[PDB]
Amino acid sequence: MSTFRLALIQLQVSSIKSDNLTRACSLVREAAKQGANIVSLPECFNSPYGTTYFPDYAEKIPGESTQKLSEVAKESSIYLIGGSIPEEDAGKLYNTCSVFGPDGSLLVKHRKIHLFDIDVPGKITFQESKTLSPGDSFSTFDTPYCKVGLGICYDMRFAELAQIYAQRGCQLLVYPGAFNLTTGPAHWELLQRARAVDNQVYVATASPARDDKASYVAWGHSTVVDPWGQVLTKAGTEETILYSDIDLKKLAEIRQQIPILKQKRADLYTVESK
């Protein structure tokens, strides 16, 4: 129970939802065949990423996409982190990561908390909040190995989320997400290394594969980082399944060697969750 196999599906995403679902589910099955215990799909894995796409590809949960995820998690007896999909609920749209357990049960649903609203002149302008609404809950789930915490993409820029997850006992944080050709080289690896080292947790990112013709061009480079801040493995830009064997004994040893989680000064500061 000290080591488990994590698989990150760096899916090539097309404009045809059923195509994405077919290929996503077949890659999940392959990951399970190669011994993965936890599998993650990437952000917006079932449809193109963009504000004019979300309304038309959005589904209720349960719906077409989550029913397929549920079924494949059950048939493969794995924990399946469902990347994210656009979700409709009560006249609002969300960017939502659904997680299914080895019995097909929904364990948790994470609606992206911090929406992707940036403007880098001459590089990338995105206003996710013009169509989507933000989530208002912390999201974790339990496995036999450890507790896992969730964020989606831009959520990775907010240190407090990882701090709260670490407080709550999470030992792996998974962030389905797609950075771009500007934010990718600058920030993608740095941010996930920061989250890992500062909170002494494993961190994994699940990105779609790069499609240079898409309106939003994904960085790629799905990555796993250990509690020492070391990159354990890193994909390229192409479609692949990335595997890592997550060693929780190593985490325990790191937390003893440089014991920053036990050295916090609660008389001076605290990160409070509401």
Add this chain to the structure above:
Amino acid sequence: MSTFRLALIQLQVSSIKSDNLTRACSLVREAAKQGANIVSLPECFNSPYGTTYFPDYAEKIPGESTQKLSEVAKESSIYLIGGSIPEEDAGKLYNTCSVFGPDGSLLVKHRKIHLFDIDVPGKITFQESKTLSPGDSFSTFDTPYCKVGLGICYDMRFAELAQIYAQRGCQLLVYPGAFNLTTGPAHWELLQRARAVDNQVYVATASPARDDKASYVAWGHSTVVDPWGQVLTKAGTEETILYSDIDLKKLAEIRQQIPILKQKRADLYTVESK
């Protein structure tokens, strides 16, 4: 006053305190001559770093070392961040960074909050709390350009300190410190880049030069990082003065482009301070 010149004195530290003070003050004068507005010395700049050294090199504040720093800040008309020195007060010893303004006045004194207590088997064991006591206050000072926040070395591992400084309006964080041949390659650059990008501030580290014969062998590599997480400049291992022109207009533009400080979810989390 949107740009100012920062100098980091990467001092080679000897066992003779007066030698360190002589050379520190001459390098400060040189930095001021080359137009530095804020100058920082490194951690434990006046004496060898180690638990059996602190008691014997410790001084009260004011004392020999701080009197020299006060005088040189006065005569050079600069803000001088006094690295750190071992400080004695009321039967206790601290690791203390004293800051003097252009009139020679003490602006603030930062006693290291998180003491350097680690044990990496086969590599480095240090127990700063054998002899030192921790500080219990946040430390900032004002300049005509911006507010500056302070930590010493291991303080840099504690994200919350930088979060609180950013809340309080700091635009530059300075950490005098010496990592070692184990923690240096793993964590030195990562941590400072994390503090910079997460809080959208400039971050600077002032290390002593490496002495391979010292009991604690310093990593070196004094560094300045911008709010985009980009390394602006980085020293080698040898004694030098590192200069950087800190562009606060750039900081303001970054905080608009990726406006994470304005996108915090205070309904879900807060970093609370004493």
